[PDB]
């Protein structure tokens, strides 16, 4: 950065509390959304997940504001912390910072999200029981263990009720994790509209990596070369017992249908 | 860059010869044009000015292609060397590489271009004579002075048209690049066959510097204004000298407008 540029930021740039936050969900495709959004000239985001509203609230809003990137007028300041979605005091705390805060939730088929979550935990703690084992409280009775975080996070409808007690539905956007993969430019169109940004991100910003199997950015923010998400993003899932899968799809179905109605959109996880 | 990404470039990436080149003009606003164009995801450009077709031609084509960035299918490879425009041998040589090469020329009011050129020379050698002194040979203007000769666009253009069809050339307005960046960039993207991505939101006007800056540069998440060397303060020039130079260029300017089919408005 040259003298004049730094000078501009020093003189006309300021640190703002985030006007929009990606609050969830874990494994929904939150890193992908944030990286794609960063391509837009009017988006500036914190690199790390702050975990302010859940883990470090006692440090204060001043500390939080301090983590934010210095922006120019017109640019939107954002942060993502997937765990907020299921944090009890989060809705109240964010509303306390500002009642007009916009919230983005990247959702995904509860079944594949649960398996994705498990896969990640398995890579960290390789000696844990199987997915089938953790899924049930009682296998033959078919009684699922809803206290297990992996299952719990996927009951979107219930968590959403918690948020709607502090925010109007109009201030929330529900992004399709599946479409973010099959047609990112398409999904980003909706996100840009929601954030009040001009639709700049388009098909030409993406390049499909056959080797990885997911789309990548033809040119990443702050770089001239492409950018595919790392090995940690797009982990291979273990094969799960067909019956266990049918049972979990059965468990989520009613909650999914409620979620479709609450959001006014059928995400297609139940056909 | 991470493993997966880097692997992708090594496997699917490849160096190409430039399909489009910014060939001029000196002080027209070439750095600004290239820096703005680099924001496009389908554009990859050489960082330095090659000076292949003019200065280092004897280094062979191998050396040239070496400097090119590794691109992905669909991405256009580009370079800028402002002095190509006035290089006699440039037209034939570039055509030899490929007669399908697209050429972009950023033009500027010949008078302000001349003063800008002088100002740059002055920054490198503060002891040179005044601009007014160098302008005249005797009311006879010293047309042999590079600062003046470079501005006779029509003359140089005739040389290029002996090797390229006018449709493979685009003349960008240096003045509009400043007043309406997105406007000129739109013309450029269309000419290069690239989708129109660069828009008004990509720019932020710097009141302190007096020029627009990129809100987000290609190689950064932060804004980017051109350096202190781009947008130099010009010395105050005698009105009579300015009048005589404008009168000198006018005939040539109007011819240039007819050749390119565009009135750049340097004479109204
Ligand atoms: N272009 C992309 N590259 C990699 N992963 C992507 C992606 N678009 C979406 N994803 C998804 O993002 C998930 C991770 O979400 P988060 O970033 O919120 O943790 C990955 O889960 P898997 O690893 O199970 O495939 C993957 O499915
Ligand atoms: N955004 C921008 N910032 C700075 N200079 C810019 C600019 N857009 C156009 N220019 C012009 O680009 C000229 C330099 O052209 P080049 O890069 O081809 O040498 C400058 O000449 P001055 O220094 O006389 O103002 C300036 O007028």
Task: Name the residue ranges covered by the structural domains of chain B.
Answer: 1-268
Indicate the helix (H) or strand (E) that contains A44. Answer: strand A43-45
Question: How many other CB atoms are found less than 10 A from the CB of residue A219?
Answer: 25
Interval between CA B177 and ligand 2 midpoint (Å): 9
> Of all atoms in ligand 2, which is nearest to the CA of residue B213?
1
A202 carries a ligand binding annotation: no
| Solved using | X-ray
CATH 3.40.50.300 fits B1-268, yes or no: yes
Residues of A in contact with B204 (CB under 8 A): 72, 74
Cis ω before A151 (30° cut-off from 0): no
Ligand 1 contact via A154 beta carbon (within 6 Å): no
Count H helices and E strands in chain A, helices first.
11, 11
> Of all atoms in ligand 2, which is nearest to the CA of residue B229?
23
Residues of A in contact with B41 (CB under 8 A): 204-205, 217-219
**A1-271: what CATH class?**
alpha beta
Ligand nearest to the CA of B116: 2
CA distances from B231 to B83, B122, B206, B208 (A): 19, 14, 12, 12
* CB-CB contact of A27 with A55 (8 Å): no
Report how far residue B15's alpha carbon sits from residue B91's, in angstroms, rounded to the nearest whole number: 23
A29 carries a ligand binding annotation: yes
Nearest to A230 among B2, B44, B221 (CB): B2
Residue A191, token pair as written in the block: 């996100």
> Of all atoms in ligand 2, which is nearest to the CA of residue B119?
24
Residue ranges of chain A whose CB lies within 8 Å of a chain B CB: 1-5, 7-9, 11, 38, 41-42, 44, 69, 72, 74-75, 197-198, 200, 202-205, 207, 209, 211-212, 216-219, 221-231
Q: Whose CA is nearest to atom 2 of ligand 1?
A: A214
Residues of B in contact with A227 (CB under 8 A): 1-2, 5
Q: Whose CA is nearest to atom 25 of ligand 2?
A: B231
What pairing do the DSSP bridges indicate for beta strands A43-45 and A20-24? unpaired
Report how far residue B157's alpha carbon sits from residue B167's, in angstroms, rounded to the nearest whole number: 13
Q: Please report the resolution in angstroms.
A: 1.9
Nearest to A4 among B9, B194, B228 (CB): B228
B150's CB contacts (< 8 A; 6+ apart) are B25, B26, B85, B86, B113, B114, B117, B156
Question: Whole-angstrom distance between the N-terminal and C-terminal Cα of chain B?
Answer: 50
Dihedral sign (CA B178, B183, B187, B192): positive
B228's CB contacts (< 8 A; 6+ apart) are A2, A3, A4
């Amino acid at each position: 950065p040259n003298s004049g540029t730094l000078a501009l930021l020093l003189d006309e740039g300021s640190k703002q509390l985030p006007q929009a936050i990606i609050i969830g969900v874990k494994k929904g495709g939150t890193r992908a959304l944030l990286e794609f959004l960063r391509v837009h000239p009017d988006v500036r985001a914190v690199g790390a997940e702050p975990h302010f509203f859940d883990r470090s609230y006692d440090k204060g809003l001043a500390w939080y504001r301090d983590l934010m990137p210095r922006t120019l007028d017109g640019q939107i300041t954002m942060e993502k912390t997937p765990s907020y979605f299921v944090t009890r005091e989060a809705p109240a705390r964010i509303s306390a910072m500002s009642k007009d805060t916009k919230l983005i939730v990247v959702v995904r088929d509860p079944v594949t999200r649960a398996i994705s979550d498990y896969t990640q935990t398995l890579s960290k703690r390789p000696d844990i029981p199987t997915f089938e084992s953790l899924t049930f409280k009682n296998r033959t009775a078919g009684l699922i263990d809803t206290s297990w975080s992996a299952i719990q996070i996927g009951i979107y409808a219930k968590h959403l009720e918690h948020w709607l007690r502090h925010f109007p539905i109009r201030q929330m956007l529900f992004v399709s994790g599946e479409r973010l993969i099959s047609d990112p430019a398409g999904e980003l169109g909706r996100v840009q509209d929601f954030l009040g940004l001009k639709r700049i991100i388009t098909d030409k910003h993406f390049y499909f990596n056959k080797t990885k199997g997911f789309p990548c950015l033809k040119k990443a923010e702050g770089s001239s070369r492409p950018h595919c998400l790392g090995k940690t993003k797009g982990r291979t899932h273990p094969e799960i017992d067909r019956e266990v899968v049918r049972r979990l799809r059965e468990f989520y179905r009613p909650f999914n249908l409620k979620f479709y109605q609450m959001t006014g959109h059928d995400f297609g996880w139940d056909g």
